[PDB]
Amino acid sequence: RAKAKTRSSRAGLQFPVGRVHRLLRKGNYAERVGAGAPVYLAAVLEYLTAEILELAGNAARDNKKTRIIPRHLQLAVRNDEELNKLLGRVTIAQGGVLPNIQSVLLP
Amino acid sequence: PHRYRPGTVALREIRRYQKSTELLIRKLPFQRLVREIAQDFKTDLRFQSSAVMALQEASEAYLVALFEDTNLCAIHAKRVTIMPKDIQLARRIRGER
Amino acid sequence: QNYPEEADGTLDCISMALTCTFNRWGTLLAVGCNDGRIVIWDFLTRGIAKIISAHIHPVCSLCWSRDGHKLVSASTDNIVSQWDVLSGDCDQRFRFPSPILKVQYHPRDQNKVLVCPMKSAPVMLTLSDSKHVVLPVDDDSDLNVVASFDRRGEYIYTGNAKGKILVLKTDSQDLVASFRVTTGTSNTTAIKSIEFARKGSCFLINTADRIIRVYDGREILTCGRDGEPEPMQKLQDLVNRTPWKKCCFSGDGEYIVAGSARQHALYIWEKSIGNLVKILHGTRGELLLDVAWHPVRPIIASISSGVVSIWAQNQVENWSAFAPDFKELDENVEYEERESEFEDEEVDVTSV
Amino acid sequence: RKTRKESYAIYVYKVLKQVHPDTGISSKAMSIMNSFVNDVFERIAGEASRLAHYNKRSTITSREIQTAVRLLLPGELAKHAVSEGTKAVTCYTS
Amino acid sequence: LRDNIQGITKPAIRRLARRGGVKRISGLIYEETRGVLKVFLENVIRDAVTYTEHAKRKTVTAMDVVYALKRQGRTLYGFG
Amino acid sequence: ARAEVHLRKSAFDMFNFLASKHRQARRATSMDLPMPMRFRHLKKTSKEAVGVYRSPIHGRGLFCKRNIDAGEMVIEYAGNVIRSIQTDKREKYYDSKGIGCYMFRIDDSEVVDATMHGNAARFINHSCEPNCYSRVINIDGQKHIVIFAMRKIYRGEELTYDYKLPCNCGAKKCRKFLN
Ligand SMILES: Nc1ncnc2c1ncn2[C@@H]1O[C@H](CSCC[C@H](N)C(=O)O)[C@@H](O)[C@H]1O
Ligand SMILES: [Zn+2]
């Protein structure tokens, strides 16, 4: 009967907590799902999303652009060391490669 | 007086060690190595015996497969002697470094 | 600056440290050891100042006096001695029941010491002679009571193993204010330790349901006897659930540190907002013993397996202390300097 | 009238307008970000389920999620993800 | 402790190389192999100790080693 | 020792940086990326790339601590963005003060001052067979001065370039007149 406050606002997040809790309940992982588990997991997913969009926006600024296309995601992931170890066996579509010519091939 | 031409004892040791199934590392030095490089993760751990035996099995199998691929790299370079850049080529094509 | 961040060395000089405390100005550190030795360091010079052999059995309690010239301890041998920092001689010694928890001077007078025995009642003593006043306990059933003076020295807060806090007047034993802590729904919880700030009226209660409650020292005086106050701030950990071991306040009473009894970490909160601000990890498999805080400067002294660590801000330097006429910039700065391009004060020098 | 499709477009757009206030995003990059969020969710959820099965429990708590993050992310990235999750749970309780 | 990477001696690397099928070996293979083995063992020991800490124990059992190796992508039959 | 009053009591120097010790791809500045992708990572790398020590050649010099590769960025020369007539007042002023000239011009309009304000790109000596050079690049409308490299440079080797009077360079292709 009070005013409804969503669980994302109560924790200070941007990703939803109710949707993550539903997808854990309806996903055949365990029988019972605790209270703090979707809050922890939505915090982790928001951190990784912000960490990749920072570098992608920086590359998009350096190419004299406004929007972000898959080339900037490719450069952002492949230049960082730990994002490259996380996304190691992953193909990003319309991404291309990094410039790399071996030393013994140029005169 | 009697000496074998160099290569003969190498070939028959290849046959002798590919025929048997045993552990090829001494196990008290390996146990000390495991406890030492586990000491930097949690102080005063307490291993079982089958845990150290499982680690020794896995490590021996890894090194034998790495030496087979290293030997193929060295034969590809038209040599016989194995050099460490062959190890580097094998571990970089495989996807480890 | 503010609350510390970096690990910054250690003091691996004398083994088997057990407890620690600072004086009012934070220039000394007294630490009892495993064989009756009290080693005092310095933070002005970062060196050992004085080592005094106390006893043969270990020391589990220490307290500085107000002037800083007298120590007091409570070893396993039921020995409470008013020591000296100059001579280093035991003066007073008389036996108690065999476990003793805590000793504490009066915060204005070096005559009154408040000894808390384990299986007894609080006993307020004098040092001009051998008087002792056994303070009253309400329940008289469990005999597990912790107590301490407040900041100024006007009252003594007492707590039992049933969650009933009492307020006794410091000299006439006036049971004037009391409350029972609202723990969950119906069950009551124990009281582990009571600590007080250095500036203001706030204090903290370390209960046994692993929740730390931050009260206000004036709401109790407002509510009077058998009132029901509620805490200003409730601080806990719910991931690891973290049963706590030791807590104290910051320099001006702004931040709270709380060491853990399971994992060797240190958690720091704000008092005003109330959010977690930093966790300070360390050696993974040790065990925590004591937590200190330097009263005017951000230094924490954590004892764990005889090793005292000091988290001290990681001073990194620059130029322009050598060449004051130069400004080491980072990127280009454009300007022109000027819009026109070309007494008898006698001050005491020996005033302290 | 069509059947609804749940996604993560609006939330990624919120995070982007926090971190770069004058930057947009195209359609294909939003599809790549949606696939990335689903992938990382399924890895961490599967590992936490397997831990709860190994220790003979019936409950996924936040401690299993913490151990799965610690097993699955490399180094300093795990060191910061643990901090973000603990801070959000602490702000949620009070 | 500073030794025990020296305890992996230099007839032992020779015997592993001959089970691998190698006829003639250089003299830098020894230090290169010691580095390879130390990196592999660190990556396995770290995950085994993580499983042990989550189970709230103090001993590393054989199943924690098996689960660590199974995460690496290297299954091991005979110890479960 | 308290009595032998001797000479060598004054040197008239701004920096007492001459010390007793004087202990003289993957990275983004070495990749083939466009220019603002390299310029952003430049200032984070240059703190650990090089340093200043006691040069045997002339006073002080720039000495690396890590293997600079071929054709990459090393450091930016950045100070006061002054105009090319305050340079004349400062040349006469530090002619009266005895302090040398630190004046790179970006183009034929404005000059960068490195006397009162700047970074560690002052302490780079002159030579005749160098291993570094310079360009002027464009990062968001503004212009900058980047010291590149010419070949792979080993840990300890001094960095020099052509500035464009007898010099202590001593190289075989010397000119002995630096104007
Ligand atoms: N290789 C060289 N030999 C002789 N003089 C040099 C030189 N390189 C630079 N100089 C002179 O030194 C000035 C550069 S500043 C020299 C380094 C630093 N100021 C120091 O001595 O501690 C310039 O005016 C130039 O005339
Ligand atoms: Zn010259």
Q: Write the DSSP string, C22-76.
A: E-SSS-EEEEEETTSEEEEEESSSSSEEEEEE--SS-EEEEEE-SSSS-EEEEET
Q: What residue segments make up the domains of chain A, in order of their start?
A: 1-107
* Nearest Cβ partner for A63 among F25, F31, F34: F34
Our CA angle for B43, B48, B50, nearest 5°, is 140
- Cβ of residue F27 closer than 8 Å to a chain A Cβ: no
**What pairing do the DSSP bridges indicate for beta strands C307-310 and B81-82?**
unpaired
Question: Using an 8 Å Cβ cutoff, are F134 and F146 in contact?
Answer: yes
The CB-side HSE value for C150 (13 A sphere, CA atoms) comes to 21
Q: Do chains D and B touch (3 or more CB pairs under 8 A)?
A: no
Question: Using an 8 Å Cβ cutoff, are F138 and F34 in contact?
Answer: no
One-character DSSP codes across B57-91: HHHHHHHHHHHHHHHHHHHHTT-SEE-HHHHHHHH
What token pair was written down for E18? 């001959």
What token pair was written down for A28? 């055949």
- Please tell me the total number of residues recorded for chain B in this structure: 97
- Please tell me the total number of residues recorded for chain C in this structure: 352
Strands (E), D3-90: 59-60
- The rounded distance, in Å, linking the Cα atoms of D71 and D48 is 10
The binding site of F comprises 58, 60, 102, 125-126, 128, 167-169, 174
Q: How far is the CA of F126 from the centre of ligand 2 (A)?
A: 8
Question: Using an 8 Å Cβ cutoff, are F120 and F50 in contact?
Answer: yes
To the question of domain C10-311 being in CATH 3.30.420.40, the answer is: no
Question: Using an 8 Å Cβ cutoff, are C110 and C67 in contact?
Answer: yes
- The rounded distance, in Å, linking the Cα atoms of A62 and F34 is 8
Number of other CB atoms surrounding residue D61 within 10 Å: 20
Question: Using an 8 Å Cβ cutoff, are C23 and C301 in contact?
Answer: no
- The rounded distance, in Å, linking the Cα atoms of C227 and C219 is 10
> Residue C217 contacts by C-beta under 8 Å, 6 or more apart in sequence?
C150, C151, C200, C201, C202, C203
Pick the CATH number of D1-94 from 2.40.50.140, 3.30.750.210, 3.90.226.10, 1.10.20.10: 1.10.20.10
Chain A: give the shortest CA distance to residue F130, in Å: 21
Question: Using an 8 Å Cβ cutoff, are C206 and C180 in contact?
Answer: no
- The rounded distance, in Å, linking the Cα atoms of F94 and F88 is 10
- The rounded distance, in Å, linking the Cα atoms of F126 and F160 is 6
* CATH code for the domain defined by B1-97: 1.10.20.10
What token pair was written down for C148? 């301490």
- The rounded distance, in Å, linking the Cα atoms of D60 and C58 is 45
One-character DSSP codes across C134-168: EPP-SS-SS---EEEE-SSSSEEEEE-TTSEEEEE
Q: How far is the CA of F121 from the centre of ligand 1 (A)?
A: 12
Helix H or strand E encompassing D16? helix D9-19
Number of other CB atoms surrounding residue C226 within 10 Å: 10
b/e map of C263-280 (b: 16 or more CB within 10 Å)?
A: bbbbbbbbbeebebebeb
The verdict on the CB of residue F125 being under 6 Å from ligand 1 is yes
What token pair was written down for C182? 């609202």
The CB-side HSE value for D27 (13 A sphere, CA atoms) comes to 0
Strands (E), D3-86: 59-60
Q: Residue type for F72, please?
A: E
Resolution to 1 decimal, in Å? 3.2
Maximum distance among all Cα pairs of chain C, rounded to whole angstroms: 89
Q: Residue type for C143, please?
A: L
Chain C: give the shortest CA distance to residue B42, in Å: 5
- The rounded distance, in Å, linking the Cα atoms of D84 and D66 is 11
- The rounded distance, in Å, linking the Cα atoms of C291 and A51 is 35
Number of other CB atoms surrounding residue C312 within 10 Å: 18
Chain C: give the shortest CA distance to residue D40, in Å: 21
* Tokens 């204090």 belong to residue: C203
Question: Using an 8 Å Cβ cutoff, are C77 and C58 in contact?
Answer: no
- Best of B20, B81, B85, B94 to disrupt the E interface (most E CBs within 10 Å) is B81
Q: Contacts of residue E21 in chain B, CB cutoff 8 Å?
A: 14, 18, 67-68, 71
Question: Which residue, D35, D9, F45, D20, is CA-closest to A59?
Answer: D20
What is the three-class DSSP state of F51?
Answer: strand
- The rounded distance, in Å, linking the Cα atoms of E32 and B89 is 13
Question: Ligand 1: which residue has its CA nearest to atom 14?
Answer: F125
F35 conformational bin, left if phi > 0, alpha if psi -120 to 50, beta if neither: alpha
- The rounded distance, in Å, linking the Cα atoms of F31 and A33 is 48
The verdict on the CB of residue F101 being under 6 Å from ligand 1 is yes
- The rounded distance, in Å, linking the Cα atoms of C180 and C188 is 8
Q: What residue segments make up the domains of chain E, in order of their start?
A: 1-80
Measured CA to CA in angstroms, residue B65 lies from B13, B60, B84, C316 at distances of: 18, 9, 15, 48
- The rounded distance, in Å, linking the Cα atoms of C308 and C17 is 8
Contact yes or no for B30 and E26 at CB 8 A: no
- Best of A63, A79, A105 to disrupt the F interface (most F CBs within 10 Å) is A79
Q: How far apart are the first and last CA of chain A?
A: 78
Write down the H helix ranges in chain A: 7-11, 18-25, 37-62, 70-79, 81-86
CATH topology of domain A1-107: Histone, subunit A (1.10.20)
**What pairing do the DSSP bridges indicate for beta strands C17-22 and C28-33?**
antiparallel
Question: Ligand 1: which residue has its CA nearest to atom 3?
Answer: F168
Q: Residue type for F22, please?
A: H
The verdict on the CB of residue F58 being under 6 Å from ligand 1 is yes
* Cα dihedral C140, C142, C143, C149 sign: negative
What is the three-class DSSP state of C308?
Answer: strand
Subunits with 3+ Cβ pairs within 8 Å of F are A, C
Contact yes or no for E37 and B59 at CB 8 A: yes
- The rounded distance, in Å, linking the Cα atoms of D65 and A41 is 7
Strands (E), D10-61: 59-60
Q: What residue segments make up the domains of chain B, in order of their start?
A: 1-97
- The rounded distance, in Å, linking the Cα atoms of B49 and E61 is 9
Instruction: Note the ligand closest to the C-alpha atom of F52.
Output: 1
> Residue F78 contacts by C-beta under 8 Å, 6 or more apart in sequence?
C329, C330, C331, C332, F112, F118, F119, F121, F144, F145
Q: Which residue of A has its CA nearest to D19?
A: A54
Helix H or strand E encompassing E29? helix E29-54
- Cβ of residue D70 closer than 8 Å to a chain E Cβ: yes
Q: Which residue of C has its CA nearest to F79?
A: C332
The CB-side HSE value for E4 (13 A sphere, CA atoms) comes to 16
CATH class entry, domain E1-80: mainly alpha
* Nearest Cβ partner for C274 among D85, D89, D94: D94
- Best of A26, A31, A53 to disrupt the D interface (most D CBs within 10 Å) is A53
